[PDB]
Amino acid sequence: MQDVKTYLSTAPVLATLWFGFLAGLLIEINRFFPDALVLPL
Amino acid sequence: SRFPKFSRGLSQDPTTRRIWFGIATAHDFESHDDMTEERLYQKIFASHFGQLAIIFLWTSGNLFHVAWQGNFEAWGQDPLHVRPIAHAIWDPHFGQPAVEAFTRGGASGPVNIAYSGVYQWWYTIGLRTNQDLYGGSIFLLFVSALFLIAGWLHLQPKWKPSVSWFKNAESRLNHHLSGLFGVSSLAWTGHLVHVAIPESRGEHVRWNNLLTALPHPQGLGPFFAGQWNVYAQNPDSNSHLFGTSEGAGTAILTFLGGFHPQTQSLWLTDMAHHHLAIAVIFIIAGHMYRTNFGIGHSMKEILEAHTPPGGRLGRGHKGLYDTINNSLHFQLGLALASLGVITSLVAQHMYSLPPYAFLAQDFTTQAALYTHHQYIAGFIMTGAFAHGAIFFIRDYNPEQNKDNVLARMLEHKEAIISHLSWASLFLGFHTLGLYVHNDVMLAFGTPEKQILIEPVFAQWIQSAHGKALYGFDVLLSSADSPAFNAGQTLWLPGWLDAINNNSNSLFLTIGPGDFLVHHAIALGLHTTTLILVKGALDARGSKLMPDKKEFGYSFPCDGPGRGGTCDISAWDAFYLAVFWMLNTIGWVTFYWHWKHITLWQGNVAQFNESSTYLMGWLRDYLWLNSSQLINGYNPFGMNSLSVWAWMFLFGHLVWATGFMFLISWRGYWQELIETLAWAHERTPLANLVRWKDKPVALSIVQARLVGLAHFSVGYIFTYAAFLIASTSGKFG
Amino acid sequence: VAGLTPCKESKGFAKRQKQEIKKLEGRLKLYAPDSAPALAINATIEKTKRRFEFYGNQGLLCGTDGLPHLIVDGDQAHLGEFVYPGLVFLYIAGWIGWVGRAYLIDVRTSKKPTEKEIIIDVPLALRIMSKGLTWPVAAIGELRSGKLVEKSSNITVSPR
Amino acid sequence: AHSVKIYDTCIGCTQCVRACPTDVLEMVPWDGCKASQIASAPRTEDCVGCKRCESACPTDFLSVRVYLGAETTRSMGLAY
Amino acid sequence: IGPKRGSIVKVLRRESYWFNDTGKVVAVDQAPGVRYPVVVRFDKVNYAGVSTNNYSPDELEQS
Amino acid sequence: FTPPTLNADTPAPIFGGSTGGLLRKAQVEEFYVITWESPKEQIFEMPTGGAAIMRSGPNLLKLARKEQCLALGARLRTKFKIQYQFYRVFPNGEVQYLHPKDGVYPEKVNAGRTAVGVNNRSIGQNANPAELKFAHKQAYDL
Amino acid sequence: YFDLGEIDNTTGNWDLYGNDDPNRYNGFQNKFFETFAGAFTKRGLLLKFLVLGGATTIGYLGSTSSGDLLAIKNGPKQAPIMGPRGR
Amino acid sequence: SISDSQIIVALVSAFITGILALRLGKSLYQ
Amino acid sequence: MTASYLPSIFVPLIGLVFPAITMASLFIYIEQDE
Ligand code: CLA
Ligand code: CLA
Ligand SMILES: CC1=C(/C=C/C(C)=C/C=C/C(C)=C/C=C/C=C(C)/C=C/C=C(C)/C=C/C2=C(C)CCCC2(C)C)C(C)(C)CCC1
Ligand code: SF4
């Protein structure tokens, strides 16, 4: 974890973990709030 | 001293490159050896005369072929149902179906149908018979012969003009604005009034009856007495048929605006007044600069005196008069920048405001005439930017331009390139993301989920022009504005009737697809401007290579060291932006041809539903209109579009052939030609034949130029064919 | 506005709702009514009917194509088409731009500044990704204090 | 043919000569560096123009500089 | 000669990659006749990958 | 330094023949002869393409380009500890000795050679092309 | 293989497939060809009458050709095809 | 329609123009 | 068409003879040693 977490903090893994979370969030926004063309707020 | 004789360094080249580069360095007169100022300007002056002679010997043969092999009189009898014939075809390779299929327009043999709008032009201007066009062809043969005599004359040492005559910018501007732009538009007005208006009204005015056929009922009396409104007294009515005396008026200079209701074209009385106005204002504007008589301006002191005192422009324009006057590439770049912005103003104002009789009804001719001036203008504008780059290498002196506006462009050049980069990236992500989003929503069965943006700024400008379709009702669409009440008795009864019509192309009804392709257009202009401003401002040097000015303009590279320096030159930025002008004007003319190809057959809803996503562009425009294009010749037979079906495939050859020069690079072909040279030098019966030029591969700049020119020839021939076969085979 | 009818009273927008359910109802005719693929098309129809009843209730403008058009000029009726989600976007996009700018300042004053960009220091990153919440007050605060922009004497400039 | 020019920023590191594949460059004595030697191009008519010397020059900006000018059978690299 | 060894200088040479960049002086040659005696080390490499370059004292200022 | 004379009696390496050798440029323009002294019978990579058995004594190799002599010469200077020299032979019979000119290789400095093509300024002090219009001189040769 | 006494033999100047036979025809065949091809010898003279003779011989059969010989002089033999929109 | 003799007038005037184009190209050479 | 036979004359000369005039005269000109 002095070097395992260093590998986990690298540029491709952190891009995979962020965009996995980012596309995971935007899909789950698009399930409970789908077809969103106009922001009502 | 072999060919080329203007460059000594290429004459000692023992390879084929000497043959090639001598063609391509032929007109780069300032790069020649033993070369001076006087020879530069006199060779450029005689080359201008040769260019004028070529233009007039071109027009003479485009008039001779209409007068000889074209049915100009038969098109004058019925301009709606007769195809205009360019010239006859004598091809030894035609079979009998090709002779029987290219015979159009009631001709005696196989002929080519003219899509250049020369019949509409010559009809509107006053030419009626074939004898008038033949006399014009002989007259312009004489004019081109006179320009050849004048070009030969100014290379003779008795009539050689000095560089001080050539760099006399004030006298050149006064005699250009007064003579070229003023007395020629006043000459025009004298034609349009003497000849073209009575030939629109049935009167046959020629040189034999020029001094007897009075253009007005009271001619030159009300002109010199001040009452000019007599020349706007009795205009042509809406029942006027073009070329006939019935329904016609007597006024020569009207201000009606709008269109002639039968031709859907501009009024010759309005264009006569237009030319009397751009003739008075150009002769008055030609008395501006100081030449010989004490009054006038010195432009050096105008540019010296135009310095903002806050120092935001530095020294302002001090030292710019000598910068333009000494640099021919600055003047040529300014001339090509203005020429591109007016060749595009030509293209935008001859489709929406058709100036020639029965030009709006002939659809494929209008399509050709828009695509012509938008491609000639996207090569003239890129030539302007390329000549700005050549100015910054071989003509820009940083000592003479010390802290002026031109030096300050180099001072903040990374800001300009980075902000053009931001604007191009913004337009690209947004236009591509919205088109790809609308593609996904039409793919996913939901057309309603598109991001469709109504272009309300340009729709507000159209309602500011007088379009009552959107209901903004601000000015010229509302009766409560002072601009409307200042215009409603003067020009707006013609203009509002022309702009509220939905069949013409005057300020068309735009939608979300128009918004999206206008951002495609802004992407194209912004990215082409990005590459070209980047080439012009990194012309002298950059952080990768600071001595780009000492390597010339069109040098290939600087070697594989320092990471790699491929396409580092400013010519290579011009090279990369020729692809961007081709893509830009391809998008522009795709939008034009599909907005009009749906207007002309009526269903504008096809464009209004399908232009917002790229599968509509691929399917309903590139695939749907190409139905009778590629069926121009079949196994079953061949049609009259067959030459346009071959020229389409021909474009797909040449364009793809350019890829051979743009992807594969030199040293592969150099080792290949080394093996070929061994094979020729060792083959029995063929070794006896020698080469004098050593066979080499195409050099790197030459390779980029040859691939670029092939790309451009294929690109202009694939679209000239598709555009002149998907409108002329399915008229409408 | 701009010659566009509202989508709640647009006959073309109601026509697209009619021909979308009818496309999905004909897809439902070849399945059993209690089957698993028929529940997906039944959920598709209720997703379609939720979508068309949401577009008409937001005051969307529908053209002659029966499609909702966005007015991006800044109309008081049309704020949620461009202005409201644009300010929502620029806050999020400025959050991305502020925590990436503040990370580079935090790793430029380090022992090996290039190893902190291939290997992103997550305790250093996550302590400023929270700090990107209040970024208009920190960007214009750095703009007013002069810390946002660098003077041109300390900026690498290519020669003329 | 090609004009190879040496500038006074050279440190005499000799690697422009070592990268030369047609024996153009040579190291002459000089008084402007620690190595007390600068490059020169006497056989610049034998220069192909490959700029291997510019790729091997560690001086920013380059001390050896090759300008592609008139090209002959030496600088085209032909064997026929 | 030179400003100082181990000092921070800013390059005024137009054609260098490190123009208007902070550099650290590692060696100044005191032998006469040397045109560019001050050896400046930079934290960033150029396109050739090196960070060591020789400049004259006229092309550097202390910053 | 007295230049070495081409003996034209030393023999060639044992080579089976190549198609990468002398074309008609050898016959009418020039060809290059490289001569070197060998310790023993070795095998070297031919710069025209192939492999040849080099002799135990002096060797003579005929090449078409000056780059083929350095590509061979730097190959037998790093892999082998062999000093080499080459020549330029013209079709009239004149042999022009080319490298090393002073007898010592150009990587090493010699006091006999002089500085030519050397500018006392840098690249940034080169003149602009706008102030050198229509002259035989250019921005670097002055 | 370098000699310094024969520069052509050490560079590749070899007649690889040549022959040194002086003659193999007879005098009757040789005198016929030089008599007939005697006005075709000079390059400047032969280039003049080949251009001028070649321009005439393509303009003759280009113009004297018939309908069956070439289809472009046959002309149309059917009704013309009318385009769309009445054009 | 134009006549046969008018084609002869055009071809001579183009040949005169072709001579004057040849004369300028000789002067542009020198 | 007024004169149908000038198509049959000028298209063979400007299409075949004139490139054979121009390219042969240029190839002489571009390979003159001078
Ligand atoms: C009244 C005097 C007079 C007039 C008529 C001109 C006329 C001209 N000069 Mg000149 N000049 C003069 C005196 C004069 N000059 C003086 C005193 C100076 C001394 C300093 C010069 C020195 C000068 C130089 C050194 C050069 C010229 C050149 C030219 C030509 C410009 C290029 C050209 O033909 O484009 C024609 C351009 C127009 C007709 C203007 C059109 C404007 C825009 C682009 C188009 C708008 C028109 C319209 C929309 C198109 C509709 C037509 C369409 C239907 C087909 C033109 C023939 C150049 C040239 O070509 O040399 C032979 C040249 O090299 N002149
Ligand atoms: C405008 C250019 C031009 C013109 C006028 C022609 C004309 C002709 N082509 Mg040709 N061609 C050309 C360009 C040209 N070609 C080019 C560019 C391509 C390459 C893509 C081709 C490829 C091509 C091939 C592959 C063939 C044709 C053939 C034909 C013939 C078809 C008519 C026929 O049935 O005659 C039938 C044949 C005859 C009546 C025989 C006449 C031969 C005469 C007598 C030759 C006399 C000597 C000659 C004039 C010397 C010329 C000197 C020099 C100054 C030009 C005709 C002679 C066909 C043919 O038969 O060629 C002869 C054929 O096989 N063409
Ligand atoms: C680099 C360089 C260069 C070049 C550049 C270029 C090429 C540019 C371009 C530019 C351009 C090409 C531009 C254009 C512009 C234009 C404009 C800017 C316009 C505007 C307009 C206006 C403003 C008007 C107004 C109005 C309107 C809008 C509406 C109504 C009417 C009116 C009229 C009022 C040169 C050569 C100089 C040289 C040096 C360097
Ligand atoms: S020769 Fe070609 S590959 Fe090599 S550096 Fe130049 S452009 Fe790049």
mmCIF file of C-alpha atoms in Angstrom, chain B residues 163-356:
data_model
loop_
_atom_site.group_PDB
_atom_site.id
_atom_site.type_symbol
_atom_site.label_atom_id
_atom_site.label_comp_id
_atom_site.label_asym_id
_atom_site.label_seq_id
_atom_site.Cartn_x
_atom_site.Cartn_y
_atom_site.Cartn_z
ATOM 1 C CA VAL B 163 9.696 51.266 -59.523
ATOM 2 C CA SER B 164 8.811 54.776 -58.303
ATOM 3 C CA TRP B 165 5.939 54.710 -60.803
ATOM 4 C CA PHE B 166 4.988 51.244 -59.540
ATOM 5 C CA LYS B 167 5.124 52.222 -55.857
ATOM 6 C CA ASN B 168 3.057 55.388 -56.497
ATOM 7 C CA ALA B 169 0.141 54.215 -54.378
ATOM 8 C CA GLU B 170 -1.730 57.545 -54.268
ATOM 9 C CA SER B 171 -1.951 57.965 -58.051
ATOM 10 C CA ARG B 172 -2.823 54.276 -58.439
ATOM 11 C CA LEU B 173 -5.656 54.568 -55.904
ATOM 12 C CA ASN B 174 -6.977 57.819 -57.413
ATOM 13 C CA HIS B 175 -7.007 56.413 -60.943
ATOM 14 C CA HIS B 176 -8.373 53.068 -59.744
ATOM 15 C CA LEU B 177 -11.242 54.553 -57.741
ATOM 16 C CA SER B 178 -11.892 57.287 -60.307
ATOM 17 C CA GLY B 179 -11.263 55.259 -63.457
ATOM 18 C CA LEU B 180 -11.493 51.521 -62.792
ATOM 19 C CA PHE B 181 -14.372 51.659 -60.294
ATOM 20 C CA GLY B 182 -15.992 54.955 -61.250
ATOM 21 C CA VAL B 183 -15.860 55.528 -65.022
ATOM 22 C CA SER B 184 -16.474 51.829 -65.648
ATOM 23 C CA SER B 185 -19.579 51.738 -63.477
ATOM 24 C CA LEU B 186 -20.691 54.972 -65.143
ATOM 25 C CA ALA B 187 -19.873 53.366 -68.480
ATOM 26 C CA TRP B 188 -21.940 50.370 -67.321
ATOM 27 C CA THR B 189 -24.834 52.722 -66.315
ATOM 28 C CA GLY B 190 -24.607 54.137 -69.871
ATOM 29 C CA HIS B 191 -24.993 50.602 -71.202
ATOM 30 C CA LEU B 192 -27.762 49.504 -68.778
ATOM 31 C CA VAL B 193 -29.686 52.717 -69.653
ATOM 32 C CA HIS B 194 -28.958 52.913 -73.376
ATOM 33 C CA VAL B 195 -29.041 49.208 -74.294
ATOM 34 C CA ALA B 196 -30.216 46.849 -71.545
ATOM 35 C CA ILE B 197 -33.337 48.721 -70.388
ATOM 36 C CA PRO B 198 -34.675 49.246 -73.978
ATOM 37 C CA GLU B 199 -33.837 45.631 -74.841
ATOM 38 C CA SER B 200 -35.857 44.643 -71.775
ATOM 39 C CA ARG B 201 -38.577 46.925 -73.177
ATOM 40 C CA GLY B 202 -38.328 45.554 -76.719
ATOM 41 C CA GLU B 203 -36.430 48.420 -78.359
ATOM 42 C CA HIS B 204 -33.416 47.234 -80.366
ATOM 43 C CA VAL B 205 -30.638 49.692 -79.497
ATOM 44 C CA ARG B 206 -27.296 49.016 -81.180
ATOM 45 C CA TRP B 207 -24.272 51.025 -82.341
ATOM 46 C CA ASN B 208 -26.044 52.056 -85.561
ATOM 47 C CA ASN B 209 -28.907 53.715 -83.642
ATOM 48 C CA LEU B 210 -27.072 54.729 -80.460
ATOM 49 C CA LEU B 211 -27.264 58.462 -81.212
ATOM 50 C CA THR B 212 -30.935 58.308 -82.288
ATOM 51 C CA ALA B 213 -32.644 55.984 -79.777
ATOM 52 C CA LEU B 214 -33.327 58.328 -76.871
ATOM 53 C CA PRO B 215 -33.268 56.400 -73.554
ATOM 54 C CA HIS B 216 -35.913 58.639 -71.943
ATOM 55 C CA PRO B 217 -38.879 60.608 -73.334
ATOM 56 C CA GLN B 218 -37.060 63.751 -72.113
ATOM 57 C CA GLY B 219 -33.391 62.781 -72.154
ATOM 58 C CA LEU B 220 -30.639 64.926 -70.560
ATOM 59 C CA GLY B 221 -33.015 67.843 -69.961
ATOM 60 C CA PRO B 222 -34.228 66.895 -66.474
ATOM 61 C CA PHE B 223 -30.706 65.623 -65.657
ATOM 62 C CA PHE B 224 -29.034 69.027 -66.002
ATOM 63 C CA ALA B 225 -32.055 70.951 -64.689
ATOM 64 C CA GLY B 226 -31.938 69.020 -61.396
ATOM 65 C CA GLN B 227 -35.307 67.216 -61.496
ATOM 66 C CA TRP B 228 -33.887 63.699 -61.470
ATOM 67 C CA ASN B 229 -37.239 62.165 -60.412
ATOM 68 C CA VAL B 230 -38.347 62.315 -64.078
ATOM 69 C CA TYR B 231 -35.928 59.391 -64.494
ATOM 70 C CA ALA B 232 -37.975 57.530 -61.833
ATOM 71 C CA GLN B 233 -41.388 58.622 -63.099
ATOM 72 C CA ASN B 234 -42.908 55.634 -64.954
ATOM 73 C CA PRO B 235 -41.317 52.340 -63.850
ATOM 74 C CA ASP B 236 -41.970 48.907 -65.293
ATOM 75 C CA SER B 237 -45.242 47.482 -64.000
ATOM 76 C CA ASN B 238 -45.863 44.016 -62.579
ATOM 77 C CA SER B 239 -47.487 42.980 -65.882
ATOM 78 C CA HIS B 240 -44.223 43.583 -67.765
ATOM 79 C CA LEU B 241 -42.885 40.640 -69.742
ATOM 80 C CA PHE B 242 -39.116 40.715 -70.169
ATOM 81 C CA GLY B 243 -37.910 41.648 -73.644
ATOM 82 C CA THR B 244 -41.348 42.829 -74.810
ATOM 83 C CA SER B 245 -42.718 46.357 -75.098
ATOM 84 C CA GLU B 246 -46.075 45.571 -73.465
ATOM 85 C CA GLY B 247 -46.436 46.366 -69.775
ATOM 86 C CA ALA B 248 -43.212 48.399 -69.805
ATOM 87 C CA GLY B 249 -42.363 51.831 -68.445
ATOM 88 C CA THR B 250 -40.183 54.752 -69.469
ATOM 89 C CA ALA B 251 -38.125 55.400 -66.316
ATOM 90 C CA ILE B 252 -34.439 54.489 -66.593
ATOM 91 C CA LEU B 253 -33.333 54.954 -62.964
ATOM 92 C CA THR B 254 -35.898 53.556 -60.549
ATOM 93 C CA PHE B 255 -35.555 52.671 -56.874
ATOM 94 C CA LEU B 256 -38.221 49.978 -56.664
ATOM 95 C CA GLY B 257 -36.284 47.225 -54.912
ATOM 96 C CA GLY B 258 -37.247 43.602 -54.797
ATOM 97 C CA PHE B 259 -37.677 41.502 -57.921
ATOM 98 C CA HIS B 260 -39.137 41.610 -61.381
ATOM 99 C CA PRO B 261 -42.273 39.463 -60.920
ATOM 100 C CA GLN B 262 -41.855 37.380 -64.085
ATOM 101 C CA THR B 263 -38.104 36.654 -63.991
ATOM 102 C CA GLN B 264 -37.743 36.638 -60.142
ATOM 103 C CA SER B 265 -34.714 38.850 -60.753
ATOM 104 C CA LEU B 266 -33.522 42.387 -60.081
ATOM 105 C CA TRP B 267 -34.795 45.318 -62.124
ATOM 106 C CA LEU B 268 -32.410 46.702 -64.769
ATOM 107 C CA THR B 269 -33.526 50.225 -63.796
ATOM 108 C CA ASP B 270 -32.495 49.530 -60.229
ATOM 109 C CA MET B 271 -29.151 48.087 -61.308
ATOM 110 C CA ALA B 272 -28.670 51.165 -63.516
ATOM 111 C CA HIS B 273 -29.359 53.426 -60.558
ATOM 112 C CA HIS B 274 -27.120 51.152 -58.447
ATOM 113 C CA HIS B 275 -24.275 51.738 -60.852
ATOM 114 C CA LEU B 276 -24.860 55.465 -61.105
ATOM 115 C CA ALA B 277 -24.577 55.476 -57.305
ATOM 116 C CA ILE B 278 -21.448 53.268 -57.124
ATOM 117 C CA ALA B 279 -20.087 55.495 -59.903
ATOM 118 C CA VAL B 280 -20.725 58.941 -58.378
ATOM 119 C CA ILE B 281 -19.424 57.652 -55.025
ATOM 120 C CA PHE B 282 -16.316 56.083 -56.570
ATOM 121 C CA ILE B 283 -15.390 59.079 -58.722
ATOM 122 C CA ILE B 284 -15.879 61.285 -55.640
ATOM 123 C CA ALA B 285 -13.857 58.819 -53.515
ATOM 124 C CA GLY B 286 -11.167 58.836 -56.228
ATOM 125 C CA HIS B 287 -10.367 62.495 -55.585
ATOM 126 C CA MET B 288 -8.965 61.640 -52.156
ATOM 127 C CA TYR B 289 -5.197 61.169 -52.374
ATOM 128 C CA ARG B 290 -2.494 63.624 -53.423
ATOM 129 C CA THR B 291 -0.815 63.017 -56.782
ATOM 130 C CA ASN B 292 0.242 66.124 -58.698
ATOM 131 C CA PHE B 293 -1.932 69.103 -57.776
ATOM 132 C CA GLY B 294 -1.282 70.067 -54.146
ATOM 133 C CA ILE B 295 -4.608 68.918 -52.736
ATOM 134 C CA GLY B 296 -5.178 65.396 -51.484
ATOM 135 C CA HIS B 297 -3.772 63.005 -48.913
ATOM 136 C CA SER B 298 -0.410 61.455 -48.260
ATOM 137 C CA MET B 299 -1.230 58.011 -46.877
ATOM 138 C CA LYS B 300 2.105 57.901 -45.036
ATOM 139 C CA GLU B 301 1.015 60.806 -42.845
ATOM 140 C CA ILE B 302 -2.476 59.309 -42.464
ATOM 141 C CA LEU B 303 -0.914 56.112 -41.108
ATOM 142 C CA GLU B 304 1.597 58.107 -39.024
ATOM 143 C CA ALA B 305 -1.135 60.318 -37.544
ATOM 144 C CA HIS B 306 -3.419 57.376 -36.673
ATOM 145 C CA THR B 307 -1.785 56.481 -33.370
ATOM 146 C CA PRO B 308 -3.946 56.164 -30.228
ATOM 147 C CA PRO B 309 -2.348 58.330 -27.524
ATOM 148 C CA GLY B 310 -2.948 55.797 -24.742
ATOM 149 C CA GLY B 311 -0.377 53.436 -26.235
ATOM 150 C CA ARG B 312 -2.770 50.494 -26.559
ATOM 151 C CA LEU B 313 -1.854 50.151 -30.248
ATOM 152 C CA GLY B 314 1.806 51.001 -29.594
ATOM 153 C CA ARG B 315 3.002 53.290 -32.365
ATOM 154 C CA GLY B 316 -0.248 52.709 -34.245
ATOM 155 C CA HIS B 317 0.279 52.493 -37.994
ATOM 156 C CA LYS B 318 3.610 54.335 -38.144
ATOM 157 C CA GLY B 319 5.861 52.776 -40.755
ATOM 158 C CA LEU B 320 3.059 50.769 -42.366
ATOM 159 C CA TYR B 321 2.924 52.785 -45.611
ATOM 160 C CA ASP B 322 6.478 51.791 -46.529
ATOM 161 C CA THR B 323 5.678 48.284 -45.256
ATOM 162 C CA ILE B 324 2.802 47.865 -47.726
ATOM 163 C CA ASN B 325 4.441 49.837 -50.552
ATOM 164 C CA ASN B 326 7.740 47.926 -50.432
ATOM 165 C CA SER B 327 6.169 44.470 -49.956
ATOM 166 C CA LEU B 328 4.323 43.095 -52.969
ATOM 167 C CA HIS B 329 3.114 40.179 -50.853
ATOM 168 C CA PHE B 330 1.376 42.560 -48.426
ATOM 169 C CA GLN B 331 -0.499 44.230 -51.302
ATOM 170 C CA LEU B 332 -1.327 40.870 -52.867
ATOM 171 C CA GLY B 333 -2.515 39.478 -49.531
ATOM 172 C CA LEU B 334 -4.695 42.545 -48.919
ATOM 173 C CA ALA B 335 -6.065 42.288 -52.464
ATOM 174 C CA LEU B 336 -6.830 38.588 -52.053
ATOM 175 C CA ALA B 337 -8.404 39.154 -48.610
ATOM 176 C CA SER B 338 -10.711 41.792 -50.053
ATOM 177 C CA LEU B 339 -11.251 39.642 -53.148
ATOM 178 C CA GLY B 340 -12.244 36.595 -51.101
ATOM 179 C CA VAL B 341 -14.628 38.659 -48.988
ATOM 180 C CA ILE B 342 -16.241 40.016 -52.133
ATOM 181 C CA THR B 343 -16.222 36.794 -54.132
ATOM 182 C CA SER B 344 -18.178 35.412 -51.231
ATOM 183 C CA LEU B 345 -20.338 38.505 -51.180
ATOM 184 C CA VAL B 346 -20.858 37.776 -54.886
ATOM 185 C CA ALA B 347 -21.917 34.203 -54.068
ATOM 186 C CA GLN B 348 -24.263 35.294 -51.260
ATOM 187 C CA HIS B 349 -25.985 38.012 -53.318
ATOM 188 C CA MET B 350 -26.617 36.308 -56.665
ATOM 189 C CA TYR B 351 -28.714 33.498 -55.244
ATOM 190 C CA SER B 352 -30.830 35.513 -52.818
ATOM 191 C CA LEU B 353 -31.071 38.588 -55.045
ATOM 192 C CA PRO B 354 -30.731 37.095 -58.570
ATOM 193 C CA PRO B 355 -29.390 39.854 -60.820
ATOM 194 C CA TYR B 356 -29.923 38.234 -64.228
#
